[PDB]
Design a protein around this ligand. Structure first.
Ligand SMILES: *[C@@H]1O[C@H](CO)[C@@H](O[C@@H]2O[C@H](CO)[C@@H](O)[C@H](O)[C@H]2NC(C)=O)[C@H](O)[C@H]1NC(C)=O
Ligand SMILES: *[C@@H]1O[C@H](CO)[C@@H](O[C@@H]2O[C@H](CO)[C@@H](O)[C@H](O)[C@H]2NC(C)=O)[C@H](O)[C@H]1NC(C)=O
Ligand code: NAG
Ligand code: NAG
Ligand code: NAG
Ligand code: NAG
Ligand code: NAG
Ligand code: NAG
Ligand code: NAG
Lengths: 86, 109, 129, 83, 48
């Protein structure tokens, strides 16, 4: 369960609420301790449960696999070659 | 065989509450079934005994709500909120946990 | 509704054999044990025994072993009890009763045993003299 | 939950058909064990329910039927219901 | 850990205890909450 407030930057910007500042208790290296984390999320990535309580959009449908930060998503050319006989 | 006693065979008047006791020489509680097998009956004059309570407190269908009861560990009580003309007869308490079944001497209302 | 029907009365001489019927109606005949209970005049109720109407297995109180035989007719849905070597102390109303627990909705082919008597018949008075 | 009354799972095997089936099995067993021997069928003596009962799956449910009513007879020279 | 009682249907049936009504705290979509669940189990699927 996330406890979110609006990001609310110093300057007024007609984009209030697009980025939320969400507090949650995340796990850590040891199973007997938890870490309080403040993370920013986009509005489109969270839904309200009913500081307000939010969950990630996918906790209702699927588990999150984190993409590895070391692997680029940039498209590269791929060539399809016939096997012999074709 | 388990012997059943039925204390408090006493006369009552219409409209008076009543209490009928039952005592067993052996506990009636079945650990696997989680229930006590004591069935209460009323035998009206000229009629066969009819069920009143199937399991100590679980009242039988069609029985007036004036009849109730409780107990455990061999000691049981049948209670009547108000005695009416239809409550006249002999009351019995079954020993259903083991065969042969016993009813006890019974009490009169 | 659920009924057990008994009727009549009988008078026997000591040593005679008597058959007491119990006709079942309103429920599956084979899915409840039928119990016999004796009630001597001005005395309490005494359990006599139980017959499984599906298999025909029986169980009798120790004092009645060798003297009471129970049978069944599943086409007529009637249970019969046969008493032999009648004695003066055996004068009583003989009641049949339907067990409160059902064995299985399709008949008594399995189960631990009965624990209560739900439906009583009117009983048959049997006198010895 | 259970709607209606609780009723036990069971299997119905025709009694006459099974009796004929066992008679045929006994005849074939006598061919190997002797024309004058006695063939007795009995219930499984022990072990896990998987092997003491008739395990099967139908309807998406896993049934364990006693079968002690089918193998209880001694063969010397209308329906059956299994819980 | 399950906390079980007999199913105990309205009608008496010589099968008491074959089906147990077991209460337990099951997980849910979020890791900070638990859901109390009442489930029926067959006697053969549970041990005391
Ligand atoms: C097994 O046989 C029993 C009877 O011996 C069947 O029970 C009957 O089912 C019909 C429904 O088709 C009911 O109308 C009858 O009243 C039932 N009889 C009794 C005594 O309960 C049972 O359905 C059969 N099961 C299977 C799977 O064939
Ligand atoms: C399992 O047990 C629970 C608790 O005994 C049952 O829930 C109760 O159901 C009765 C129905 O009359 C209600 O009056 C109670 O208020 C309920 N209590 C709770 C805590 O839920 C539940 O129904 C049982 N499950 C089944 C399938 O019988
Ligand atoms: C984190 O856990 C504590 C309890 O240890 C709780 O009081 C706090 O509200 C939790 N924070 C969030 C954001 O849920
Ligand atoms: C949760 O999932 C269901 C389908 O599993 C879906 O219909 C529903 O819209 C989802 N919730 C939200 C907030 O999208
Ligand atoms: C199985 O069910 C069918 C349904 O029509 C019936 O005809 C058949 O006799 C049944 N078999 C047994 C062994 O009960
Ligand atoms: C059928 O059952 C009877 C029961 O007495 C048995 O004697 C007989 O051998 C069985 N088999 C056949 C084929 O009749
Ligand atoms: C058993 O009986 C069959 C009947 O045809 C016969 O062929 C066979 O030889 C017999 N076996 C013995 C050992 O008697
Ligand atoms: C099958 O029924 C018989 C009846 O006496 C019983 O002894 C046996 O244990 C049952 N089988 C199983 C696997 O429970
Ligand atoms: C579920 O957890 C609560 C504590 O939050 C506990 O009191 C309750 O007994 C648990 N229920 C079961 C069935 O263990």
């Amino acid at each position: 369960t996330l406890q979110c407030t609006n990001y609310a930057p110093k300057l007024r910007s007609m984009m209030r609420g697009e980025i939320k500042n969400c507090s949650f208790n995340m796990t850590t290296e040891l199973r007997d301790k938890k870490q309080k984390v403040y993370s920013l999320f986009y509005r489109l990535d969270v839904v309200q449960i009913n500081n307000k309580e939010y969950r990630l959009i996918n906790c209702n449908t699927s588990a999150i696999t984190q993409a590895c930060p070391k692997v680029s998503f940039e498209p590269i050319p791929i060539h399809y070659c016939a096997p012999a006989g074709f | 065989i388990v012997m059943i006693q039925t204390p408090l065979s006493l006369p009552v008047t219409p409209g008076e509450p009543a209490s009928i006791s039952c005592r067993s020489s052996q506990s009636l509680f079945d650990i696997e079934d989680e229930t006590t097998y004591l069935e209460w009956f009323l035998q009206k004059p000229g009629q066969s005994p009819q069920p009143l309570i199937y399991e100590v407190s679980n009242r039988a269908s069609g029985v007036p709500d004036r009849f109730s009861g409780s107990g455990s560990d061999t000691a049981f009580t049948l209670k009547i909120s108000r005695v009416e003309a239809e409550d006249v007869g002999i009351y019995y308490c079954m020993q259903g946990i083991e065969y042969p079944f016993t009813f006890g001497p019974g009490t009169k209302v | 509704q659920v009924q057990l029907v008994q009727s009549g009365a009988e008078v026997k001489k000591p040593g005679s054999s008597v058959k007491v019927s119990c006709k079942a109606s309103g429920y599956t005949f084979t899915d409840h044990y039928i119990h016999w209970v004796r009630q001597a005049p001005r005395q309490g109720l005494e359990w006599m025994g139980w017959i499984n109407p599906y298999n025909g297995n029986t169980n009798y109180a120790q004092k009645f072993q060798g003297r009471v035989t129970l049978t069944r007719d599943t086409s007529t849905t009637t249970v019969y009890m046969e008493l032999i070597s009648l004695r003066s102390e055996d004068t009583a109303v003989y009641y049949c009763a339907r067990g409160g627990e059902y064995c299985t909705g399709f008949g008594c082919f399995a189960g631990k045993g009965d624990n209560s008597l739900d439906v009583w018949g009117r009983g048959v008075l049997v006198s010895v003299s | 939950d259970v709607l209606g009354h609780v009723r036990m799972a069971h299997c119905n095997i025709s009694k006459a058909t099974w009796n004929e089936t066992l008679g045929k099995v006994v005849k074939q067993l006598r061919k190997h064990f002797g024309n004058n021997t006695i063939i007795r069928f009995a219930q499984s003596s022990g072990g896990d329910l998987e092997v003491t009962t008739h395990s099967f799956n139908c309807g998406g449910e896993f049934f364990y039927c006693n079968t002690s009513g089918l193998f209880n007879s001694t063969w010397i020279s209308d329906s059956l219901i299994l819980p």
